[PDB]
Each structure stands twice: as structure tokens, then as C-alpha cells.
A = this chain, B = another copy of it.
């Protein structure tokens, strides 16, 4: 047997391409304007006047209009340990998210498969990504079951990943599609805040900020190299990826899975660290392509908070329109952790097509997608649009 023959016959030829995007969110919609009143009443903290004022300002500055949440008032009233700031509550939280993560991801995945138009039996790889809960067999096994994928689908279960992982799953699917002839990767990010929700405490305002920002959602992609012309429909192409850890950012964002659920901590200035290091990330990606005008590429940035977006825009002098798709997803859905950046790609390509632009990346050729999260980690994906 010749391994070099086997190897040339095994691998794909072209760039890993996004061929379909589908999204889903819990039915329960939570208005941001009145969230403070609702959250202080459900967590029994109505008597903390200075603290609720603090949360009202947080919610007012978030630039989030609404979020979708698996957690309802009814569910929360049955779980006082989840409504406390710190009470043993992981078993109850796990019981919710071990079921909700695959459920919600299945909705998003069905949508993406329908868009793609090809038999689910041609799905050869599955990436499932979440930051809410873990189990064995994982959510990857659950989604194989729920979707009726072939039992020999090759699975990649990405657990406890964090806000920066929409970039990581793309980085992964790129190598899976490109190195394997005929491979079609289903990619699912599904994030539920039932593991992080907790009551307010005036000595942990970083935990509280989280309660203003994180929302639920799943996004699914079909990724593959060598699309069949006129049968499959390219949306975006991946060209180059990177992951780095920003200097001076030790302990900026930490989340620990405990008996009281997933705690959320912010010890450094995230917006300032991201803004200070985004240029270096851009030159590593775009210098080899000869591009240095960052207003000439389309943008996708994980909206960890609005201040990240503002401080990046200001550092680079981005025109205000560059972050439009990013800010629309933040407005309608809040920070959905790893899924957010995938919703943004959907928003951008949908708006570009609806508005008659020349490419799926706002009429521009090249673009960038950034994931930001614990480490402080920056994930970079270089994208090329598709004509029409």
C-alpha cells in the first residue's frame, strides 16, 4: 500500500466554505428595559436600592434591547438555590442544560440542513460547542441521536469553551473540511445561561455585569471544501486563522464550574486589552494579503460588551457602519457566548443579500471575524465573501 497515494486521494482541494447558517433561541423573550425590576424581584433583592440602580445603569448602557432565555419566572420560582447569589445548585442547572443545549442546537441544525439542501447522511463530521454544562456521552452524542445523523459521524465535543469559541469552531472546521475529500461538517454552538444565572451581590459587580449581558441561542453551520457548483451555495470562505493570548491579561476573565454553578469574574479591563491588541492581530492576518485599510474589509467582532466594540472602533478609526451587523445581533440577542459571532455572520449575509449588495460581506471582498474570551484569548478568522 502506498501512503502517499492514500494521502493524495484522501484530502480535499479548496478552501473550507460556509454553505449554510441556521439559528435558534428559547421562545422566552426578555425585554432589557424592564429587566432590572424583573431580576431583582425574582432573586428577592428588591430592598437593595443602590445595587438595583447600579444594574439599571448597566442594562441601560448594555445596548441590548432583548434576550432569549430558557429560564422563565416559573422555572426560577421552583429553583430558589439558582436565584441566590451563591447556593449549591449545579445538579439542578445541569439537569436543565444537559437537555436544553442539544434541544436548541437541534433547532438551529435542522434549519441549516434545510438551507444546505443535501441529505443529512452526507454529514461526515460534527462539532458541538457549549459553555453551559457537561455530560457523558456529551451533547455531540445527543445531537447525533436527535438529528438521526449516521452513527459513524466523526465528533468533536467542545465543552466549557467560553465567549471566544465561535472563532475556535471555525478554526477547527476549516482543517476538518480541507484535509478530507467530500467532508461536510455540521457545526453547532449552543449556549444557555441557566448555569451562570445567579442573584446579585454588591461586593461582586463583575458577576452582576454578566447578568446584564449574557443571553441564550444556538447557531449551526454546514462547512465544506469543494462545493458542488449550483447545487451547494457558498456563503463565506475561510482562508487563514489564528489564536493568541494577549500580554498582561492574566485573570482578565475567569469562570469556574462549582457546586453553585458557573461563576463569572472580571479582574482587568477587557475593552482596553482587546483594543490594545487588535492591531497586532490585524497585521498578522492582513499584512500577508497586502491590506492595511481596516475600513476596506468586512467585520464580525464578538460583542462581549458594547465597550469592547466602541474601544476597537475608536482605536482603529473604523467608520460607524463597520460594526453594524455586530451591534444588531447584540441589540436583538445579547452576548450569546460562542454562538454570537455565528449569528453575526448570518445577519451580515442576510442584510447584504436582502439589500442587493455585490457580495455576502457587505459588497467587500475580504473580512475578519474575532472571538474574545478567557485567557485573554483572541481568535482570528480571515474570510473571503462570495459574489451575490
Of all chain B residues, the one with the shortest Cβ separation from A151 is B245
Cβ contact of A160, chosen from B88, B136, B171, B180, cutoff 8 A: B136
Report yes or no: A94 in contact with B6, Cβ–Cβ below 8 A.
no
Partner of A245 from B134, B144, B160, B175 at Cβ < 8 Å = B144
| Interface pair A135/B160, CB less than 8 Å apart | yes
Q: Does A243 contact B (CB under 8 A)?
A: yes
Q: State the CA gap A15–B5 with chains docked (Å).
A: 11
Question: Which residues in B have their C-beta under 8 angstroms from that of A176?
Answer: 175
Chain A interface residue count, Cβ-Cβ cutoff 8 angstroms = 67
Contact with B along A279-302 (1 / 0, CB 8 A): 000000000011000000000000
How distant is the Cα of A94 from the Cα of B179 in the complex, in angstroms? 37
Given A14-B4, A160-B157: A175 and B171 interface contact (C-beta under 8 Å): no
Q: Tell me if A326 is interfacial: C-beta within 8 Å of chain B.
A: no
List of B residues within 8 angstroms of A278 by Cβ: none
Chain A positions 42 through 68: 1 when the CB is less than 8 Å from some CB of chain B, otherwise 0: 000000000000000000000000000
Tell me whether A259 is interfacial, beta carbon within 8 Å: yes
Q: Which residue of B lies closest to A178 (CB)?
A: B179
Q: How far is the CA of A253 from the CA of B88 in the complex (A)?
A: 27
Inter-chain contacts of A366 with B (CB < 8 A): 1
B374 & A258 in contact (Cβ 8 Å cutoff): no
User: How would residues 354 to 388 of chain A score, 1 for a CB under 8 Å from any chain B CB and 0 otherwise?
Assistant: 00000000000010000000110100000010000
Cα A160 to Cα B172 in complex, Å, equals 18
Q: Top 4 nearest A-B pairs by Cβ distance?
A: A136-B255, A151-B245, A179-B179, A134-B160
- Can you name 10 A-B residue pairings with CB atoms under 8 Å? A1-B366, A7-B14, A90-B259, A91-B259, A135-B256, A136-B254, A151-B246, A153-B243, A159-B160, A259-B259
